[PDB]
Write a protein that binds this ligand. Structure first.
Ligand SMILES: Cc1cc2nc3c(=O)[nH]c(=O)nc-3n(C[C@H](O)[C@H](O)[C@H](O)COP(=O)(O)O)c2cc1C
Ligand SMILES: Cc1cc2nc3c(=O)[nH]c(=O)nc-3n(C[C@H](O)[C@H](O)[C@H](O)COP(=O)(O)O)c2cc1C
Ligand SMILES: Cc1cc2nc3c(=O)[nH]c(=O)nc-3n(C[C@H](O)[C@H](O)[C@H](O)COP(=O)(O)O)c2cc1C
Ligand SMILES: Cc1cc2nc3c(=O)[nH]c(=O)nc-3n(C[C@H](O)[C@H](O)[C@H](O)COP(=O)(O)O)c2cc1C
Ligand SMILES: O=C(O)[C@@H](O)c1ccc(O)cc1
Ligand SMILES: O=C(O)[C@@H](O)c1ccc(O)cc1
Ligand SMILES: O=C(O)[C@@H](O)c1ccc(O)cc1
Ligand SMILES: O=C(O)[C@@H](O)c1ccc(O)cc1
Lengths: 355, 355, 355, 355
């Protein structure tokens, strides 16, 4: 594999159609899904030359831990959909690569099992109708050694996934939400209906700023709000005591027509003015994309779909190869741009171009 | 049906070619028709997160009536072209959905029959060569319980519809202008000539600001000027006593090269500064599009062609299904954007993107 | 014919390939040729509503003569290439339509014959190596009743027409420059070489501001400089005593990469501030395009290729039909935009859109 | 050949696939490669009219030598890949055309042999791990009569060339780095690996500002820094004593996502404010492109790939024909734009357009 695109081709070959669609798809007309790519493609970097590159390092310190790259594996629910080893395969590869792994509320292997892999993991939280279940998950995550709580704030309910609706997508019997008893809702098959979407409407309570405060009071871990796009919500996140935010439109899966995170990132970085870490996701497909995100001010990126392509294609080894490729591309891009550190990359300037 | 696009496919299958073309087409090169879509596709919403969504409502108050959505059915002439029940089918579905229905001057069922369906309808006015006929129509509409007069101001005559000209389109014998004796002009078949266009040139007198004043003096109902695009015309509409305007290029059917309404909407909303309701139409094809229009400042939208797709596909039940789908999409988009009310949606910010 | 595009299709059918290419083509990569269309397509008009349209007139006064439309037939060399009646057919149709016709220095029928058709024609001047021949042409034109001298200033030599080079294009024996003895240069056939281009390099002297003054001193007729794109050249044209300019890139046939005239027009109109007439050409293909040009400030447009399509398709009657179609489209567009006169159309505002 | 595009077609026919790919390709997704073309295509020139063109000259003075055009042949490694005569063929044609030729550190014929051709050549420097080898090359170049040192500053290592990786590209046995003993690294064949890229990582030391000073102190020749894109790096180049810079993204072969040089050129020209020569390269494919670069402020351009197309197609004679074509196109474009000298072309204004 010489690019991430090689992995998508590999994953389309092996996965069942409806599972590839669950992975690839977005909400509505997929405008936001496509815009995440368009937005990155329009950014050009203004590289610097003739700087010392005798010790180029791609490492960052984030949430009290050194990471090998300015990158983490995004939370992706139900990883057993893509490979039998699911989250364990991805977590092992991430650990070995020195990349944080985000354990999901809707993981198909229990959070404690995934945490036992090691690698100082993060935990993604969905707010549930019974608050106590969500706060218990936070405490479980913390007890298990997770190092940050990534509270997803852009899913009061699931978006309208037309591929899933048309496919009548439902979880296979052998994939479950291992952190719960989540009931049978996501497994029932109904025509023209996404079973996971009606499961979400039944199970999820919309989170509010009060929910954020309840989480912040319940843990010593940094709380990271994922799904922020409005500048004032970024500012309020800092005021609320968040240790970070992820500037994100949920991979185009939530509001169709939501601005790409990459388009809000610079304005958000300026507004928070170092008050929290500012991550971004959506459409990161190369080390050069990582560099672009960094140059726009991101502390780090998340990568979602490509990690699942690698998992589907070749399990743990596939994820390892993806992370090695990304690591090489990030090092390459940084050095070619005159950056011996991620901090230097954040000081790069950019210019918008066309198509 | 999981999107409005499903209905267009359904309608193309069933309708005769020349009738589908009468419905789908625009004037000239169809530049304005296409631009209505392009304009919406370039707008991205900046959603808000973590707000209370315990009682999301899509309702608005407009022209003294609560509507279930920030949407009305646009005036579309000659609905019996699309289904035998024509306007009655659409009006019944709109009534049941709590959506205002606009009865047309050129309705193929009489305005009194359509009004008798109930649902507190609006009445669209074309100015006719004999003024008295137009003012009599206004009084008929008011007597029949219509709640607003939507005076269409962008048709001094009909645009050059090249599809209709090439098809030699004429009304079938069984479709007539039921509010009149409209003569035989729209039924005569002449090669290279749109019969409806030469009927319009013969029948319609260009409206002026004096015509608006004559209407305003003849009724207690709110007068809504449909087809406003210039900021100064919006301002003058308020000065003239209009209760609303519809910012519109008539679905790309009138001046080819007219700016899309969606491109003028924000500037118009700022200029009228709450002095009248500001509606928009042209290319609204989803709840997300409704949200975009609302975020740009619209009080409500009109929807034209999709309602006719639904009517053609499945009559009253088709229109019902379309309105239920739109209602769900509007609720979904609003909540995902952090808006518990349409007023909150109007306070959303937007950002232009590419393609 | 219901659009100008109908005529291009008709002309491609009938004309020999190399002649269609001589007509259609531009210089270099044809970037400027395509940009002339792109530039118009990006302009949208903001129409006005509710104005008095009881006496819509498309007439203008220009160079001391009333014209039926804000339009003239552009100078196009060698019209016998397209139809045996050549310039006489086009001039007769233009006369009958009340549209000025521009007689070319390189007309294939003598300027006196074309002038005898009537219709108060204009005369286009190329500066020749022997100055006296060019000044004699000016005096011939004036003696014959031409009413303006359109001095083409963007052809110090002919552009690189790659279609003509690849075709080895040369004039047929039966088409000559009837105002001269122009020699045999444009008729000799050489592979990979445009015979008309090497004829031009041999025959034409580059014009300068001194040439303009020589012409201005030699005639009482208004001198109109065709091919102006720089704002300072427009200003200097006024200072030099020009009665008009044509803002033009010569239909993309001269400098490949020259800005479209339509893109410079507004700035030029502002800079000359009523000091001369400001015409534009390049890519005008409808009455709506005329309206756009007018709204950007043009006094009038020239139309080139479409007139030749009409000539090729159906001779004099073809040109008549084209001019009738354009007249109807201009009237239609003006009225739909709320303009009872061309002056009102010049006061319309515009907005740039995308694709 | 009537355009440069004719030569690319000719070269694709004759060259082996992997060699054409080594020539044509860029790094990563080839975003920067494509953007070099897009960037030029968006620029339009505002030509001037009516200026004296009695002695149009395309000549410039640069680095103490008159050049026939504002153009030099870019450094392109390993020219024997394209034709058996390699660099000698290109250098002879450049000499005969009066165009500077840039001899490469990685030339496949020794720099002294190429210099012996005559034509006052330039020498391109790569910084090598043993500094002394690079400084010895500079002294060899100077002793051999090279007139400028073009220090390439954008290759701390070679970019990720995915075409070369996929092809497993390696130099054929009969092509070597003739200025060295360069070892066997670039010839070894490894699957999924570019042999030239791992040779570069092994052989090249990243250059720094200290390296620039070492070169500047070692020669009396002008030092020209090739690969500058940041405005502050251009300013620093002047402060460092550079006689010129080449604003360049290395033909899209280095950082994928690097801004095109043409997009930075105007800002760089303003910032250096005559303190050094400012050249540009990337995607120059016609005399009109040269004119655009000049109008944006360039002193001269480099041309890379097209020279190799010509070499591959027809050897020395091919390169001669390419340079004659470019010379004619530059003269044509300049005159059509009203420029009797390159200095006048630099005073032209430009306007951005679309696609
Ligand atoms: C199949 C799938 C499942 C996901 N599950 C979750 C989730 O449970 N929680 C969450 O916060 N985000 C979830 N996401 C969103 C990702 O964390 C991330 O925002 C998005 O995938 C990033 O875009 P990318 O896929 O373009 O890299 C999911 C994304 C995908 C594709
Ligand atoms: C077939 C058809 C007939 C129409 N008839 C009328 C009419 O009689 N009066 C009017 O004001 N607008 C009329 N319109 C314009 C619509 O009210 C509306 O402005 C346009 O359809 C909105 O764009 P949309 O179709 O993209 O939703 C008509 C539109 C169509 C497609
Ligand atoms: C075949 C052809 C011949 C032309 N001959 C002349 C000419 O002799 N003199 C001149 O000033 N312009 C000439 N032009 C340019 C036109 O006057 C005009 O600028 C251009 O055609 C306008 O663009 P349009 O063809 O897109 O309408 C010619 C154009 C064409 C296509
Ligand atoms: C096959 C190839 C080899 C090259 N070798 C070198 C090199 O050895 N040194 C260097 O500074 N640039 C090198 N370049 C970059 C060129 O000098 C130049 O920047 C680029 O080709 C200009 O873009 P163009 O090819 O679009 O004209 C090379 C380019 C190509 C295509
Ligand atoms: O985007 C998703 O699919 C993910 O965020 C999700 C999956 C299942 C679910 O119930 C809710 C959200
Ligand atoms: O756009 C239309 O077709 C509609 O507005 C209309 C229909 C018939 C007519 O005579 C005049 C206008
Ligand atoms: O654009 C043209 O072809 C026209 O302007 C022209 C024709 C013949 C010629 O010799 C010089 C110019
Ligand atoms: O772009 C290139 O290929 C050229 O700059 C280069 C060639 C070989 C090499 O080892 C290093 C650079």
């Amino acid at each position: 594999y010489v690019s991430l695109a090689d992995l998508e081709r590999a994953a389309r070959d092996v996965l069942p159609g409806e599972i590839f669609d669950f992975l690839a798809g977005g909400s509505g007309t997929e405008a936001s899904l496509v815009a995440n790519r368009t937005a990155l493609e329009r950014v050009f970097v203004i590289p610097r030359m003739l700087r010392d590159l005798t010790d180029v390092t791609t490492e960052i310190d984030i949430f009290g831990r050194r990471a090998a790259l300015p990158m983490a594996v995004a939370p992706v629910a139900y990883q057993r959909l893509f490979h039998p080893e699911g989250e364990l395969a991805v977590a092992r590869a991430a650990r070995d690569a020195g990349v944080p792994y985000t354990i999901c509320t809707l993981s198909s292997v229990s959070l404690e099992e995934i945490a036992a892999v090691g690698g100082r993991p993060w935990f993604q939280l969905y707010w549930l109708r019974d608050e106590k279940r969500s706060l218990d998950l936070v405490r479980r995550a913390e007890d298990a050694g997770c190092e940050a709580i990534v509270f997803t704030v852009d899913v009061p309910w699931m978006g309208r996934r037309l591929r899933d609706m048309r496919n009548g997508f439902a979880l296979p019997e052998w994939v479950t939400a291992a952190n719960f008893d989540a009931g049978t809702a996501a497994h029932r098959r109904t025509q023209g209906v996404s079973a996971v979407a009606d499961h979400t409407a039944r199970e999820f309570a919309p989170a509010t700023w009060e929910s954020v405060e309840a989480v912040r009071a319940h843990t010593d871990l940094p709380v990271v709000l994922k799904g922020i796009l409005a500048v004032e919500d970024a500012r309020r996140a800092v005021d609320a005591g968040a240790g970070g935010i992820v500037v994100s439109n949920h991979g185009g899966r939530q509001l169709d027509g939501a601005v790409p995170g990459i388009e809000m990132l610079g304005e958000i970085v300026a507004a928070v003015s170092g008050g929290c870490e500012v991550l971004v996701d959506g459409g990161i497909r190369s080390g050069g994309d990582v560099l672009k995100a960094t140059a726009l001010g991101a502390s780090a990126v998340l990568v979602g779909r490509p990690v699942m392509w690698a998992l589907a294609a070749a399990g743990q080894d596939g994820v390892r190869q993806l992370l090695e490729l990304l690591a090489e591309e990030v090092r390459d891009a940084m050095g070619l741009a005159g950056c011996e550190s991620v901090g230097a990359a954040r000081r790069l300037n950019t210019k918008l171009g066309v198509v």
